[PDB]
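Good morning,

Attaching, inline, the backbone tokens for the sequence recovery test we're adding to the shared suite. The designed sequence is right after.
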């Protein structure tokens, strides 16, 4: 099971632990994110605003606050942890859905949500055009207790496709889970 820094090889640490409600999985860190050693650090990326908008977080975090997410039952990782850049530019060996699956199997989050179709596609082995947004049916190679969701990219490059509904439905689902946990 890798450590959170991949033995110092990861550009930005994973934020993972047991008992999380939601892990949000990107493709790879943008260059800006890699340089900041943070997640979704491009100031035009809508991720941090979106989490606040949909009540996954109660304030808008700044990118350097990414590791505080577990206090709200959220964590973070990416399919590619040792490379940065736009998806189309990444070398083929960047994508390690094998290592992602090992982490999911270890930490058992309630939900894994891919923050773009591409990430989900690299992991599920199916082309993006055949994936809808929202909850998917339980796949491989994958724990049936961990729900899997695919979300519209918050990147500036996905601006033509961005929609809030899958993000808000996710937020509602996380509310429902954290509320059942208390009832």
């Amino acid at each position: 099971v890798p450590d959170l820094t991949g033995s110092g090889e990861y550009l930005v640490p994973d934020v993972l632990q047991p008992g999380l409600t939601l892990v949000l999985v990107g493709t790879a860190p943008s260059g800006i994110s890699a340089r900041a050693r943070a997640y979704y650090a491009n100031p035009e990326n809508k991720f941090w605003r979106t989490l606040h908008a949909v009540g996954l977080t109660p304030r808008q975090l700044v990118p350097q606050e990414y590791a505080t997410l577990p206090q709200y039952g959220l964590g973070l990782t990416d399919v590619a942890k040792r490379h940065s850049g736009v998806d189309a530019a990444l070398p083929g060996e960047a994508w390690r859905p094998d290592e992602l699956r090992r982490k999911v199997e270890h930490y058992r989050p309630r939900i894994v949500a891919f923050t773009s179709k591409r990430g989900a596609s690299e992991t599920l082995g199916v082309p993006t055009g055949k994936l809808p947004y929202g909850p998917q049916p339980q796949p491989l190679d994958w724990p049936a207790e961990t729900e899997l969701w695919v979300l519209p990219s918050t990147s500036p490059l996905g601006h033509n496709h961005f929609r809030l509904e899958p993000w808000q439905a996710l937020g509602d689902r996380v509310r429902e889970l954290r509320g059942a946990a208390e009832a």
